[PDB]
């Protein structure tokens, strides 16, 4: 088929969501602007051919609020209106995902950088540029 799509299981949401929808809902209209948070060097094609099948999954949404509704439909408390799903999904993106990067009036660019770092960190292991983390490594314990 197409192969190797990227999704994002995020809390208080019943179903996984493709990451491009998450960056569109998070505040980024464009595609190059989304891609600048994930692939830090655009002259690497091997990143590009792996990142494009999840981009081609979601060229039907190009604006923020439709992606907000796409999240809020999947919500644990599914809103009945268009403007209740948006408030629920905006609450989730504001507070539920990634508290450690900031919960404030505007922390969307910083949360976007950390999420793009997570996607980049996934792509490096899927390409074998790095190695997988060990669960028993007691540096990773507290």
Partner 1 sequence: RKLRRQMDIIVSEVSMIRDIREREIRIYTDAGRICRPLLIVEKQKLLLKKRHIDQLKEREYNNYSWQDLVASGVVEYIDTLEEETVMLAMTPDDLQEKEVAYCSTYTHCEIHPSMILGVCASIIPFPDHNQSPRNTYQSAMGKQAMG
Partner 2 sequence: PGFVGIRFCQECNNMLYPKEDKENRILLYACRNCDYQQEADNSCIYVNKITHEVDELTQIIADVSQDPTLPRTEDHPCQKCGHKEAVFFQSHSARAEDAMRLYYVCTAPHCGHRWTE
Which range touches partner 1 (CB under 8 A), out of 45-53, 60-68, 78-86, 131-139? 131-139
Q: What is the closest distance, in whole angstroms, from the C-beta atom of residue 125 to partner 1 in the complex?
A: 11
User: Which is nearer to partner 1, 3 or 139 (by Cβ)?
Assistant: 139
5 and 54 Cβ atoms separated by less than 8 Å: yes
Residue 142 binds partner 1 (CB under 8 A)? yes
User: Cβ closer to partner 2: 52 or 87?
Assistant: 52
Helices (H), the chain: 19-26, 32-35, 45-55, 64-73, 82-91, 108-126
Report the sign of the C-alpha dihedral through residues 102, 105, 110, 114, in that order: positive
User: To the nearest whole angstrom, how small is the minimum distance from the Cβ of residue 78 to partner 1?
Assistant: 37
Q: Per-residue string for binding with partner 1, 81-120, x by CB under 8 A?
A: ----------------------------------------
Cα 87 off chain centre by:
18
Q: Judge whether 120 and 35 are in contact, CB under 8 Å.
A: no
């Amino acid at each position: 088929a197409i192969g190797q799509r990227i999704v994002a299981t995020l809390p208080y949401i019943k179903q996984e969501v493709p990451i491009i929808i998450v960056f569109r809902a998070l505040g980024f209209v464009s595609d190059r602007d989304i891609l600048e948070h994930i692939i830090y060097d655009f002259e690497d094609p091997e990143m590009m051919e792996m990142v494009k099948p999840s981009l081609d999954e979601a060229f039907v949404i190009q604006e923020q609020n439709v992606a907000l509704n796409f999240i809020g439909s999947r919500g644990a408390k599914p809103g009945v209106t268009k403007e209740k799903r948006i408030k629920y999904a905006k609450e989730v993106l504001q507070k539920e995902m990634l508290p450690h990067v900031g919960v404030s009036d505007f922390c969307e660019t910083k949360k976007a950088y950390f999420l793009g770092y997570m996607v980049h960190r996934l792509l490096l292991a899927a390409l074998g540029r790095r190695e997988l983390d060990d669960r028993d490594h007691y540096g990773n314990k507290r």
